[PDB]
Each structure stands twice: as structure tokens, then as C-alpha cells.
Short mmCIF file of C-alpha atoms and ligand atoms in Angstrom, two decimals:
data_model
loop_
_atom_site.label_atom_id
_atom_site.label_comp_id
_atom_site.label_asym_id
_atom_site.label_seq_id
_atom_site.Cartn_x
_atom_site.Cartn_y
_atom_site.Cartn_z
CA UNK F 1 5.68 19.61 -13.95
CA UNK F 2 5.57 16.51 -11.72
CA UNK F 3 9.32 16.66 -11.05
CA UNK F 4 10.98 13.54 -9.62
CA UNK F 5 14.23 14.25 -7.77
CA UNK F 6 14.95 11.24 -5.54
CA UNK F 7 18.28 10.29 -3.96
CA UNK F 8 18.36 7.15 -6.13
CA UNK F 9 18.34 9.34 -9.26
CA UNK F 10 15.69 7.20 -11.00
CA UNK F 11 12.51 8.61 -12.54
CA UNK F 12 10.32 5.50 -12.31
CA UNK F 13 6.82 6.32 -11.02
CA UNK F 14 6.36 2.72 -9.88
CA UNK F 15 5.32 2.26 -6.25
CA UNK F 16 4.63 4.68 -3.38
CA UNK F 17 6.03 8.21 -3.74
CA UNK F 18 6.05 11.39 -1.64
CA UNK F 19 6.10 15.08 -2.58
CA UNK F 20 8.12 17.87 -0.94
CA UNK F 21 6.15 20.73 0.61
CA UNK F 22 8.60 23.40 -0.58
CA UNK F 23 10.25 22.47 -3.89
CA UNK F 24 7.44 20.07 -4.89
CA UNK F 25 9.75 17.27 -6.06
CA UNK F 26 8.59 13.65 -5.82
CA UNK F 27 10.72 11.05 -4.02
CA UNK F 28 10.29 7.30 -3.46
CA UNK F 29 8.88 6.43 -0.03
CA UNK F 30 11.18 3.39 -0.02
CA UNK F 31 14.35 5.31 -0.91
CA UNK F 32 13.67 7.84 1.85
CA UNK F 33 12.65 6.43 5.24
CA UNK F 34 9.01 7.52 5.20
CA UNK F 35 5.48 6.12 4.85
CA UNK F 36 3.03 7.37 2.21
CA UNK F 37 0.62 8.01 5.10
CA UNK F 38 2.60 11.10 6.15
CA UNK F 39 0.65 14.33 5.62
CA UNK F 40 3.73 16.59 5.57
CA UNK F 41 7.19 16.07 4.06
CA UNK F 42 10.35 17.93 3.04
CA UNK F 43 13.19 16.58 0.88
CA UNK F 44 16.85 16.32 1.94
CA UNK F 45 17.63 19.58 0.13
CA UNK F 46 14.82 21.60 1.72
CA UNK F 47 15.27 19.82 5.06
CA UNK F 48 19.04 19.00 5.16
CA UNK F 49 19.45 15.63 6.90
CA UNK F 50 21.66 12.48 6.74
CA UNK F 51 20.68 10.27 3.80
CA UNK F 52 22.02 6.80 2.99
CA UNK F 53 22.65 6.99 -0.76
CA UNK F 54 22.74 3.19 -1.05
CA UNK F 55 19.12 2.04 -1.34
CA UNK F 56 18.20 -1.68 -0.95
CA UNK F 57 15.59 -3.32 -3.16
CA UNK F 58 12.72 -2.90 -0.70
CA UNK F 59 10.68 -5.75 -2.23
CA UNK F 60 13.58 -8.02 -1.27
CA UNK F 61 14.00 -10.46 -4.23
CA UNK F 62 13.39 -14.20 -3.86
CA UNK F 63 16.68 -15.07 -5.58
CA UNK F 64 18.55 -13.18 -2.83
CA UNK F 65 21.06 -15.42 -1.06
CA UNK F 66 21.29 -15.04 2.77
CA UNK F 67 24.06 -12.61 3.74
CA UNK F 68 23.70 -10.72 0.44
CA UNK F 69 21.52 -7.64 -0.07
CA UNK F 70 20.31 -6.40 -3.47
CA UNK F 71 20.34 -2.66 -4.18
CA UNK F 72 18.74 -0.32 -6.71
CA UNK F 73 21.76 1.98 -6.34
CA UNK F 74 25.22 1.73 -4.76
CA UNK F 75 28.15 4.11 -4.26
CA UNK F 76 31.48 3.48 -5.95
CA UNK F 77 33.37 5.82 -3.61
CA UNK F 78 31.64 9.10 -4.49
CA UNK F 79 30.09 7.97 -7.79
CA UNK F 80 26.49 6.75 -7.60
CA UNK F 81 25.62 3.75 -9.78
CA UNK F 82 22.06 2.59 -10.46
CA UNK F 83 20.36 -0.47 -11.97
CA UNK F 84 20.14 0.14 -15.72
CA UNK F 85 23.21 2.40 -15.84
CA UNK F 86 25.77 1.98 -18.60
CA UNK F 87 29.38 2.20 -17.45
CA UNK F 88 33.00 2.14 -18.60
CA UNK F 89 34.88 -0.87 -17.22
CA UNK F 90 38.59 -1.45 -16.60
CA UNK F 91 40.10 -3.98 -19.02
CA UNK F 92 40.45 -7.73 -18.50
CA UNK F 93 44.02 -8.13 -17.23
CA UNK F 94 44.21 -11.94 -17.15
CA UNK F 95 47.19 -13.59 -18.85
CA UNK F 96 45.52 -16.99 -18.40
CA UNK F 97 43.13 -17.53 -21.38
CA UNK F 98 40.98 -19.99 -19.41
CA UNK F 99 40.85 -17.97 -16.16
CA UNK F 100 38.02 -15.68 -15.03
CA UNK F 101 38.13 -12.03 -16.26
CA UNK F 102 40.14 -10.01 -13.74
CA UNK F 103 39.34 -6.29 -13.80
CA UNK F 104 41.47 -4.03 -11.59
CA UNK F 105 40.53 -0.94 -9.56
CA UNK F 106 39.73 2.25 -11.50
CA UNK F 107 42.33 3.97 -9.30
CA UNK F 108 45.09 2.15 -11.22
CA UNK F 109 44.11 3.73 -14.56
CA UNK F 110 46.84 6.07 -15.82
CA UNK F 111 44.91 8.31 -18.23
CA UNK F 112 41.27 8.09 -19.34
CA UNK F 113 40.81 7.01 -22.93
CA UNK F 114 37.19 5.80 -22.93
CA UNK F 115 37.64 4.15 -26.34
CA UNK F 116 40.03 1.74 -24.59
CA UNK F 117 37.45 0.72 -21.96
CA UNK F 118 34.68 -1.89 -22.13
CA UNK F 119 31.10 -0.58 -22.08
CA UNK F 120 28.68 -2.46 -19.84
CA UNK F 121 25.02 -2.37 -18.77
CA UNK F 122 24.40 -2.88 -15.04
CA UNK F 123 21.33 -5.10 -14.51
CA UNK F 124 21.84 -5.86 -10.81
CA UNK F 125 23.75 -4.39 -7.86
CA UNK F 126 24.38 -6.11 -4.52
CA UNK F 127 26.49 -6.18 -1.37
CA UNK F 128 27.75 -9.67 -0.50
CA UNK F 129 28.22 -11.47 2.84
CA UNK F 130 31.40 -9.41 3.33
CA UNK F 131 29.67 -6.12 2.35
CA UNK F 132 31.65 -6.00 -0.91
CA UNK F 133 29.84 -4.28 -3.79
CA UNK F 134 29.27 -6.15 -7.06
CA UNK F 135 27.40 -5.63 -10.33
CA UNK F 136 25.88 -8.06 -12.83
CA UNK F 137 25.04 -7.21 -16.45
CA UNK F 138 25.73 -7.65 -20.17
CA UNK F 139 28.50 -6.30 -22.41
CA UNK F 140 28.22 -3.99 -25.41
CA UNK F 141 30.54 -4.75 -28.33
CA UNK F 142 32.30 -1.98 -30.27
CA UNK F 143 32.20 -2.18 -34.13
CA UNK F 144 35.78 -3.51 -34.35
CA UNK F 145 34.78 -6.38 -32.04
CA UNK F 146 32.16 -7.57 -34.55
CA UNK F 147 32.57 -9.87 -37.56
CA UNK F 148 31.35 -7.96 -40.61
CA UNK F 149 31.97 -7.44 -44.33
CA UNK F 150 34.63 -4.78 -45.20
CA UNK F 151 31.81 -2.91 -46.96
CA UNK F 152 29.77 -2.46 -43.76
CA UNK F 153 29.76 1.03 -42.24
CA UNK F 154 28.75 2.06 -38.71
CA UNK F 155 28.15 5.10 -36.54
CA UNK F 156 31.41 6.15 -34.87
CA UNK F 157 29.55 5.84 -31.55
CA UNK F 158 27.61 2.68 -32.41
CA UNK F 159 27.63 -0.32 -30.07
CA UNK F 160 26.05 -3.79 -30.17
CA UNK F 161 24.24 -5.66 -27.39
CA UNK F 162 25.83 -9.06 -26.73
CA UNK F 163 24.56 -12.04 -24.62
CA UNK F 164 27.84 -11.92 -22.70
CA UNK F 165 27.07 -11.54 -18.99
CA UNK F 166 29.57 -10.93 -16.18
CA UNK F 167 29.83 -10.38 -12.43
CA UNK F 168 32.18 -7.48 -11.69
CA UNK F 169 33.50 -5.81 -8.49
CA UNK F 170 32.22 -2.23 -8.27
CA UNK F 171 35.79 -0.89 -8.18
CA UNK F 172 36.11 -1.91 -11.84
CA UNK F 173 33.82 0.97 -12.88
CA UNK F 174 35.69 3.92 -14.42
CA UNK F 175 32.56 6.01 -15.03
CA UNK F 176 29.04 6.18 -16.48
CA UNK F 177 27.97 6.44 -20.11
CA UNK F 178 24.69 6.67 -22.02
CA UNK F 179 23.54 4.10 -24.59
CA UNK F 180 20.47 5.21 -26.56
CA UNK F 181 18.44 4.07 -29.55
CA UNK F 182 18.95 6.05 -32.78
CA UNK F 183 15.60 7.88 -32.53
CA UNK F 184 16.20 8.96 -28.92
CA UNK F 185 19.78 9.95 -29.81
CA UNK F 186 18.48 12.25 -32.57
CA UNK F 187 15.86 13.92 -30.36
CA UNK F 188 17.85 14.94 -27.27
CA UNK F 189 20.30 14.13 -24.48
CA UNK F 190 19.62 13.09 -20.83
CA UNK F 191 20.56 15.79 -18.31
CA UNK F 192 24.15 15.67 -17.07
CA UNK F 193 25.57 13.45 -19.82
CA UNK F 194 28.64 14.43 -21.85
CA UNK F 195 28.42 14.37 -25.67
CA UNK F 196 31.53 12.15 -25.66
CA UNK F 197 29.72 9.50 -23.57
CA UNK F 198 26.65 9.03 -25.78
CA UNK F 199 26.42 5.89 -27.92
CA UNK F 200 23.89 4.40 -30.35
CA UNK F 201 22.66 0.80 -30.17
CA UNK F 202 19.77 -0.57 -32.25
CA UNK F 203 21.20 -4.03 -32.87
CA UNK F 204 22.06 -7.12 -30.84
CA UNK F 205 24.52 -9.84 -31.87
CA UNK F 206 24.32 -13.62 -31.69
CA UNK F 207 27.03 -15.66 -29.96
CA UNK F 208 29.18 -15.86 -33.11
CA UNK F 209 28.90 -12.05 -33.41
CA UNK F 210 28.41 -12.22 -37.18
CA UNK F 211 24.62 -11.87 -37.12
CA UNK F 212 22.99 -8.48 -36.51
CA UNK F 213 19.44 -8.51 -35.08
CA UNK F 214 17.29 -5.38 -34.66
CA UNK F 215 16.32 -4.66 -31.04
CA UNK F 216 12.54 -4.29 -30.73
CA UNK F 217 12.06 -3.08 -27.15
CA UNK F 218 14.62 -0.99 -25.25
CA UNK F 219 15.09 -2.75 -21.91
CA UNK F 220 15.94 0.42 -19.98
CA UNK F 221 14.00 3.47 -21.33
CA UNK F 222 15.12 7.00 -20.43
CA UNK F 223 12.78 9.64 -19.02
CA UNK F 224 12.05 12.13 -21.82
CA UNK F 225 10.49 14.80 -19.58
CA UNK F 226 12.18 18.27 -19.74
CA UNK F 227 13.55 18.09 -16.19
CA UNK F 228 15.38 14.87 -17.10
CA UNK F 229 15.91 15.19 -20.86
CA UNK F 230 17.28 18.07 -22.94
CA UNK F 231 15.49 18.06 -26.31
CA UNK F 232 17.52 19.29 -29.29
CA UNK F 233 16.07 22.21 -31.36
CA UNK F 234 16.12 19.97 -34.45
CA UNK F 235 16.41 16.18 -34.80
CA UNK F 236 19.95 15.04 -35.60
CA UNK F 237 20.77 13.18 -38.81
CA UNK F 238 24.04 11.32 -37.97
CA UNK F 239 26.09 9.60 -40.68
CA UNK F 240 27.06 5.92 -40.83
CA UNK F 241 30.49 6.80 -42.21
CA UNK F 242 32.75 4.81 -39.86
CA UNK F 243 34.63 1.65 -40.83
CA UNK F 244 36.76 -0.40 -38.36
CA UNK F 245 38.68 -1.92 -41.28
CA UNK F 246 39.64 1.39 -42.89
CA UNK F 247 41.05 3.67 -40.18
CA UNK F 248 44.21 5.88 -40.28
CA UNK H 1 -1.45 -8.21 15.09
CA UNK H 2 -0.33 -5.39 12.80
CA UNK H 3 -3.29 -6.45 10.64
CA UNK H 4 -5.34 -3.44 9.57
CA UNK H 5 -8.88 -4.60 8.76
CA UNK H 6 -10.99 -2.19 6.71
CA UNK H 7 -14.05 -3.81 5.13
CA UNK H 8 -17.39 -2.43 3.89
CA UNK H 9 -19.14 -3.87 6.97
CA UNK H 10 -16.94 -1.74 9.25
CA UNK H 11 -16.41 -4.71 11.58
CA UNK H 12 -12.94 -5.60 12.89
CA UNK H 13 -13.28 -9.39 13.12
CA UNK H 14 -10.21 -11.27 11.86
CA UNK H 15 -12.61 -14.24 11.74
CA UNK H 16 -13.79 -15.59 8.39
CA UNK H 17 -11.70 -15.80 5.21
CA UNK H 18 -9.75 -12.56 4.70
CA UNK H 19 -8.13 -10.99 1.63
CA UNK H 20 -5.44 -8.30 1.59
CA UNK H 21 -5.27 -5.33 -0.78
CA UNK H 22 -1.91 -5.31 -2.58
CA UNK H 23 -1.91 -1.49 -2.66
CA UNK H 24 -2.99 -0.18 0.76
CA UNK H 25 -2.38 -3.44 2.67
CA UNK H 26 -5.77 -3.44 4.43
CA UNK H 27 -7.58 -6.74 5.03
CA UNK H 28 -11.20 -7.34 3.98
CA UNK H 29 -13.63 -10.23 4.44
CA UNK H 30 -13.79 -12.34 1.27
CA UNK H 31 -17.42 -12.90 2.29
CA UNK H 32 -18.26 -9.18 2.09
CA UNK H 33 -16.33 -8.48 -1.12
CA UNK H 34 -17.58 -11.47 -3.16
CA UNK H 35 -14.11 -12.88 -3.83
CA UNK H 36 -12.42 -16.25 -3.29
CA UNK H 37 -9.78 -16.47 -0.54
CA UNK H 38 -7.09 -17.29 -3.11
CA UNK H 39 -7.10 -14.47 -5.67
CA UNK H 40 -3.56 -13.66 -6.79
CA UNK H 41 -4.20 -9.95 -7.42
CA UNK H 42 -6.56 -8.18 -5.04
CA UNK H 43 -7.36 -4.48 -4.74
CA UNK H 44 -9.95 -3.01 -2.35
CA UNK H 45 -12.92 -0.84 -3.35
CA UNK H 46 -10.91 2.34 -2.68
CA UNK H 47 -7.80 1.26 -4.62
CA UNK H 48 -9.87 -0.24 -7.45
CA UNK H 49 -13.27 1.57 -7.42
CA UNK H 50 -16.15 -0.73 -8.42
CA UNK H 51 -19.88 -1.18 -7.54
CA UNK H 52 -20.21 -2.66 -4.05
CA UNK H 53 -23.19 -3.86 -2.01
CA UNK H 54 -22.81 -2.81 1.63
CA UNK H 55 -25.81 -4.97 2.54
CA UNK H 56 -24.01 -8.27 3.15
CA UNK H 57 -26.22 -11.39 3.68
CA UNK H 58 -25.55 -14.13 6.24
CA UNK H 59 -23.85 -16.74 4.03
CA UNK H 60 -24.65 -19.61 6.46
CA UNK H 61 -28.38 -18.79 6.57
CA UNK H 62 -29.38 -19.52 10.21
CA UNK H 63 -31.61 -22.43 11.20
CA UNK H 64 -35.08 -21.60 12.58
CA UNK H 65 -35.10 -18.51 10.34
CA UNK H 66 -38.41 -16.71 9.72
CA UNK H 67 -40.15 -17.77 6.45
CA UNK H 68 -39.63 -15.42 3.49
CA UNK H 69 -36.86 -13.54 5.30
CA UNK H 70 -33.30 -13.04 4.03
CA UNK H 71 -30.81 -12.47 6.86
CA UNK H 72 -27.92 -9.99 6.74
CA UNK H 73 -24.70 -9.15 8.59
CA UNK H 74 -25.19 -5.44 7.82
CA UNK H 75 -28.06 -3.37 6.40
CA UNK H 76 -28.33 0.26 5.25
CA UNK H 77 -30.77 2.62 6.94
CA UNK H 78 -30.67 5.28 4.22
CA UNK H 79 -26.98 6.20 4.58
CA UNK H 80 -26.28 4.61 7.97
CA UNK H 81 -24.89 1.07 7.88
CA UNK H 82 -26.14 -0.95 10.84
CA UNK H 83 -24.48 -4.22 11.88
CA UNK H 84 -25.07 -7.17 14.21
CA UNK H 85 -23.87 -6.14 17.67
CA UNK H 86 -24.51 -2.41 17.11
CA UNK H 87 -26.14 -0.45 19.92
CA UNK H 88 -28.61 2.14 18.64
CA UNK H 89 -31.03 4.87 19.65
CA UNK H 90 -34.68 3.97 18.97
CA UNK H 91 -37.68 6.24 18.35
CA UNK H 92 -40.25 6.26 21.16
CA UNK H 93 -42.90 8.02 19.06
CA UNK H 94 -45.22 5.21 17.99
CA UNK H 95 -48.43 4.55 16.05
CA UNK H 96 -51.23 2.00 16.50
CA UNK H 97 -52.92 0.37 13.50
CA UNK H 98 -55.28 -2.68 13.90
CA UNK H 99 -55.24 -3.77 17.55
CA UNK H 100 -53.20 -2.29 20.40
CA UNK H 101 -49.92 -3.06 18.57
CA UNK H 102 -47.76 0.11 18.86
CA UNK H 103 -45.10 0.56 16.16
CA UNK H 104 -42.15 2.98 16.31
CA UNK H 105 -42.15 5.82 13.77
CA UNK H 106 -39.39 6.91 11.36
CA UNK H 107 -36.42 8.98 12.58
CA UNK H 108 -37.21 11.43 9.75
CA UNK H 109 -40.18 12.68 11.81
CA UNK H 110 -37.88 13.71 14.67
CA UNK H 111 -36.96 17.41 14.52
CA UNK H 112 -34.80 17.92 17.63
CA UNK H 113 -32.97 14.86 18.96
CA UNK H 114 -32.79 14.29 22.71
CA UNK H 115 -30.83 11.17 23.70
CA UNK H 116 -32.66 10.75 27.02
CA UNK H 117 -35.99 10.73 25.16
CA UNK H 118 -34.93 7.67 23.13
CA UNK H 119 -34.48 3.96 23.91
CA UNK H 120 -31.18 2.06 23.82
CA UNK H 121 -31.40 -1.24 21.94
CA UNK H 122 -28.85 -3.88 20.96
CA UNK H 123 -29.20 -5.33 17.45
CA UNK H 124 -28.60 -9.08 17.17
CA UNK H 125 -30.32 -9.94 13.87
CA UNK H 126 -31.04 -8.00 10.67
CA UNK H 127 -33.29 -9.18 7.83
CA UNK H 128 -35.28 -8.11 4.78
CA UNK H 129 -38.81 -9.48 4.44
CA UNK H 130 -40.62 -10.48 1.22
CA UNK H 131 -41.31 -6.84 0.31
CA UNK H 132 -37.65 -5.93 1.05
CA UNK H 133 -38.66 -4.08 4.22
CA UNK H 134 -35.70 -3.95 6.63
CA UNK H 135 -36.03 -5.07 10.25
CA UNK H 136 -33.82 -5.57 13.30
CA UNK H 137 -34.16 -7.90 16.29
CA UNK H 138 -32.67 -7.57 19.78
CA UNK H 139 -33.14 -6.43 23.38
CA UNK H 140 -33.42 -3.13 25.26
CA UNK H 141 -31.12 -1.50 27.79
CA UNK H 142 -32.67 -0.02 30.94
CA UNK H 143 -31.77 3.37 32.42
CA UNK H 144 -31.36 3.50 36.26
CA UNK H 145 -34.73 5.21 36.86
CA UNK H 146 -36.40 2.38 34.92
CA UNK H 147 -34.93 -0.15 37.37
CA UNK H 148 -36.46 -1.27 40.67
CA UNK H 149 -33.43 -0.65 42.88
CA UNK H 150 -32.81 -0.26 46.62
CA UNK H 151 -32.72 3.46 47.65
CA UNK H 152 -29.07 3.07 48.70
CA UNK H 153 -27.93 1.84 45.28
CA UNK H 154 -25.58 4.11 43.31
CA UNK H 155 -25.03 4.35 39.54
CA UNK H 156 -22.76 5.92 36.93
CA UNK H 157 -24.27 8.89 35.07
CA UNK H 158 -24.23 6.89 31.83
CA UNK H 159 -24.91 3.47 33.37
CA UNK H 160 -27.35 1.18 31.56
CA UNK H 161 -28.74 -2.28 32.35
CA UNK H 162 -29.17 -5.22 29.97
CA UNK H 163 -32.72 -6.61 30.06
CA UNK H 164 -34.16 -9.77 28.40
CA UNK H 165 -36.84 -7.69 26.67
CA UNK H 166 -36.71 -8.45 22.94
CA UNK H 167 -38.47 -6.69 20.07
CA UNK H 168 -38.76 -6.68 16.28
CA UNK H 169 -38.22 -3.10 15.08
CA UNK H 170 -38.45 -1.49 11.60
CA UNK H 171 -34.98 -0.19 10.73
CA UNK H 172 -36.48 3.28 10.18
CA UNK H 173 -36.93 3.55 13.96
CA UNK H 174 -33.15 3.79 14.43
CA UNK H 175 -32.10 7.39 15.08
CA UNK H 176 -28.37 6.63 15.36
CA UNK H 177 -25.65 4.48 16.93
CA UNK H 178 -24.27 4.63 20.47
CA UNK H 179 -21.54 2.72 22.31
CA UNK H 180 -22.18 0.44 25.29
CA UNK H 181 -19.07 -0.76 27.15
CA UNK H 182 -18.07 -2.51 30.37
CA UNK H 183 -16.39 -0.37 33.04
CA UNK H 184 -12.91 -1.69 32.17
CA UNK H 185 -13.27 -0.81 28.48
CA UNK H 186 -14.89 2.56 29.26
CA UNK H 187 -11.89 3.42 31.44
CA UNK H 188 -9.30 2.18 28.92
CA UNK H 189 -10.40 4.08 25.80
CA UNK H 190 -12.95 4.83 23.07
CA UNK H 191 -13.75 3.22 19.68
CA UNK H 192 -12.75 5.58 16.86
CA UNK H 193 -15.49 7.94 15.68
CA UNK H 194 -17.80 7.85 18.72
CA UNK H 195 -19.03 10.88 20.67
CA UNK H 196 -18.65 10.77 24.47
CA UNK H 197 -22.35 11.72 24.71
CA UNK H 198 -23.05 8.36 23.02
CA UNK H 199 -20.86 6.34 25.41
CA UNK H 200 -22.50 4.25 28.14
CA UNK H 201 -21.50 1.72 30.82
CA UNK H 202 -23.19 -1.65 31.35
CA UNK H 203 -21.81 -4.28 33.73
CA UNK H 204 -25.10 -5.71 34.97
CA UNK H 205 -28.18 -7.43 33.56
CA UNK H 206 -31.69 -7.58 35.02
CA UNK H 207 -34.65 -9.97 34.94
CA UNK H 208 -37.95 -9.40 33.10
CA UNK H 209 -39.16 -7.66 36.28
CA UNK H 210 -36.01 -5.52 36.64
CA UNK H 211 -35.67 -6.04 40.41
CA UNK H 212 -32.66 -8.37 40.37
CA UNK H 213 -29.14 -7.35 39.32
CA UNK H 214 -26.57 -9.83 37.97
CA UNK H 215 -22.98 -9.07 36.95
CA UNK H 216 -22.09 -9.91 33.34
CA UNK H 217 -18.98 -12.09 32.99
CA UNK H 218 -18.90 -12.72 29.23
CA UNK H 219 -19.16 -9.84 26.75
CA UNK H 220 -21.32 -11.01 23.84
CA UNK H 221 -19.75 -8.43 21.51
CA UNK H 222 -16.12 -7.76 22.64
CA UNK H 223 -14.76 -4.55 21.12
CA UNK H 224 -11.53 -4.45 19.11
CA UNK H 225 -8.86 -2.57 21.06
CA UNK H 226 -6.32 -2.41 18.22
CA UNK H 227 -4.98 1.18 17.78
CA UNK H 228 -6.39 1.58 14.25
CA UNK H 229 -9.82 0.86 15.74
CA UNK H 230 -9.39 2.11 19.31
CA UNK H 231 -7.84 5.20 20.90
CA UNK H 232 -6.32 4.31 24.29
CA UNK H 233 -6.46 6.88 27.09
CA UNK H 234 -2.83 7.56 28.23
CA UNK H 235 -4.18 7.14 31.77
CA UNK H 236 -7.08 4.96 32.95
CA UNK H 237 -10.31 6.86 33.67
CA UNK H 238 -11.52 7.17 37.27
CA UNK H 239 -15.37 7.54 37.24
CA UNK H 240 -17.23 7.63 40.56
CA UNK H 241 -20.76 6.31 41.11
CA UNK H 242 -23.28 8.87 42.40
SR1 SR Z 301 -1.89 -11.43 -2.87
ZN1 ZN Z 302 14.26 6.81 -5.18
ZN1 ZN Z 303 12.28 20.11 -1.44
ZN1 ZN Z 304 -16.66 -7.37 6.02
ZN1 ZN Z 305 -6.56 -0.89 -1.14
#
């Protein structure tokens, strides 16, 4: 089936890869510490061995500052985060309106209401000169955060891409979520994602957040193969019956 | 260097303009692959299959070249690529035609191959004539029994002697390649792919008479000892002359 089960948890078939001699899963040569010239190989499940779950960008980027190392995936304690992952973020706690957004540790959160957390797309991960983990990416706006006509209706799980970028400490990540296009949302669900953490986004906003532009190319496409994606028996037909203005 | 050189010529010279394959990381002569030295995206013939010509001409055509002759770095003898510097087995079976002129026959005629019943020859030049007939130029190696030596003189079992006896040969007269090394190299290791039976030692040259023996100081064709090209013996060999 050409199954990819790497430690990084990404399905990209870009670059050198290596197959296991027992379970037949493909893994990135860069993520594991192995050449493509090796004639025999076993994965970390078939051949249990220490694995560093934090994988550096092996083509080290040019924009990399000395002392800092860019990563394709990092660990937030026990939770693995990857480039292209959507996450829930702790709120901005600043009482100074001019100050930088201060987002506290996830460990301080009392009870998890995901609707009260900011949703964010990780574009970059890196360890700094002090080995502190950071992420860079853009925000997704919830429907109530947008300027719209009272007539406008949304999906209850609809979000909107916004050209608002931020550097965050990795501790500010509460958990992962899944942001799909409508078509993909209707077809199936990526393996190991909760129904309650699946959102729809087809539109981006301008800076005023009054203008709604259709997204043409999804920047981070999901693997649709059966080992990675659970196809629904029938395509969903969700309803745009949610209004931020008119809520109980 | 950690430079792996794998070109269609099969030579290991880091000399000349080189280009690296962005997939396998091997280096190839720009001059053999028909590419400029500064091509942003390069892939070799194995990573990006395409028609190649293994018969690579000498881009600086040599002065004093024979008229109507195109010179080459490497030429194909059927399926065997032969290169400048190669040591080869040569057919002894020959034919006369107009005058005395004996000419060595094709290797296709040979049924059973005996190494000792062939001549060892070093190829220096390779060319195609006007009719695209392939030829090689170079000098012979002499076996010990072919040398006029003092009765007391001892030899290695595979010892050969360089002689200034040059000949134009039709490429068809080549039976196969062998490997001629100095003692030091012979003792250190083997080039990849070579049979021991095709490995010989030469440290001395003779005169046209083959009575006088002179030690060679400068190897005309030094062999690449890089691990990708050369397997090193874990311990130096200890051959004894008798
Ligand atoms: Sr290049
Ligand atoms: Zn990987
Ligand atoms: Zn396995
Ligand atoms: Zn070449
Ligand atoms: Zn290549």
C-alpha cells in the first residue's frame, strides 16, 4: 500500500526514504539516522531502539541564525508538533494594549474549552540559542471575529485565514486541531483526529477583516491515502446555519 | 576528498571541470556529459536517463595529430570501454596482407583465452580514422623470459617490464583489460573490479634491446586510491621474488 510511518508523522514522499524489512513501512532517511545506500533496515517498532523525536531540517535553511536550529517537528513535553500542524493556543493575557502578545503555559489552563482558544497554523519550528522551543505561523479567525452583515451565515466549525503572523513559545500550545477545505471535510477525516477538532476554511480575510476571499490552493494538503485518511461512506452535506450575531 | 566521481569514462580524475548530481551526489566531468560547469540543476545519466555517448573526444585536439583522425579519451570495443592509460591484453594471432606487415586479428576469433599467450600493452592514444575504424597507440610490456637478464636475477611471478616499443593496433585486437601496478601499490590494495589473475607488477623499464634495467620513479598513470575506487588490504602484502 506504500505505507509511510515515520517518527516525524509526515507523509511527504519528498527526498530519500527507506523501507522496513518486516512491516514494510517507509521512513525518511533524514529523520532516522541512516543512508539510502543501506541494503537492510528495520524501523524503531520492529527493531526497538532510542529515537530522537525532534528532527532538524536536514537541508539547513539559509535564513537560519547561528545558535538557532530549525526543526520539522518538536516535542511539547509529550505532544509532537509538526510544520503545517494546526493547534489550539492559550489566550493573550496582556493588559497593555501596545505590548507584545503574552501567552502563558498550557499547564495553567483550568478546564479545556477549545472554543475559548485561538486556532493557529504552525509554519516553522525552531530551538533558539538557549534551546527554547518556538513556533511561527498565522492565525485563523472565528466567525465572531469577522466583520460581516447580520444576514451572513457560517458553518459552526468555519474559520478564516488571516495575514496575522506571530512567534509563540511552544508551551503556549494546548493541543492539535485539523483545518480542512469543505470538499476534504465532506469526504473523510485524517486518522487520529477528533470530530470536535475538525474545522472548515475556504476563505481568507484582508487586514480589515471585512473582505472574504476564496482560497485557491491549500498550503498544507493532507494525505488522502487509506492508512492516513478515513473516508466517509457518503460525502457530508453540512449546513451553513450558524450566526455569530444571533446566538442564545 | 569525500568526492565520489562516477562518470561515463570510468576515470577518477578530479581534473577538468566537474558537475555534481543533485540526487546521488556523484561528480561527473562536464566534458564527458556535454554540459556547462554552471548548470543550476544537474542530474546524472542514472538519475535522469537520457541518450549518452560513451565515446568522448579529446576536446583540446592534440598538435601533431594524424590527418583525418579524430582523437578520443575513451572508445568502445563492442561493449568494452577502453580509456587512455588502460593496460590491455592483445591478440598475438596475426595476418599478413600486402608486404610483410603483420596485423593482429579480432578477439572474436579466440575460443579459449590464455593470458600468457597474449601481449600486455599500455594504451596512450585512441582515435577513429576517416572510415570510423577505431585504433589505439602505445607500448608493450615485456615478460621476464623476454628480457635479456643475468642468470642470477630474480623476478616476481607477475612482474612485467616497460619497453619503448610502440605500435598502432586495431581496437579489435584487445581481448580485455589488466592492471599494471608498482610494488607499493600492488602491496597496498586493488582497484575495484579487477581479477588478481589480471594484476601485474612493473617497477622497471628496459631499452629497445631489453638488456638494461632502469627503475621507474614517476608513474605516468597514478591510480586513484580513494575507497570508492580502491579496496585497501588491511595488511600490506609481502611478495617474494623467485
Ligand atoms: Sr547544483
Ligand atoms: Zn520523517
Ligand atoms: Zn517495521
Ligand atoms: Zn568523464
Ligand atoms: Zn545521480
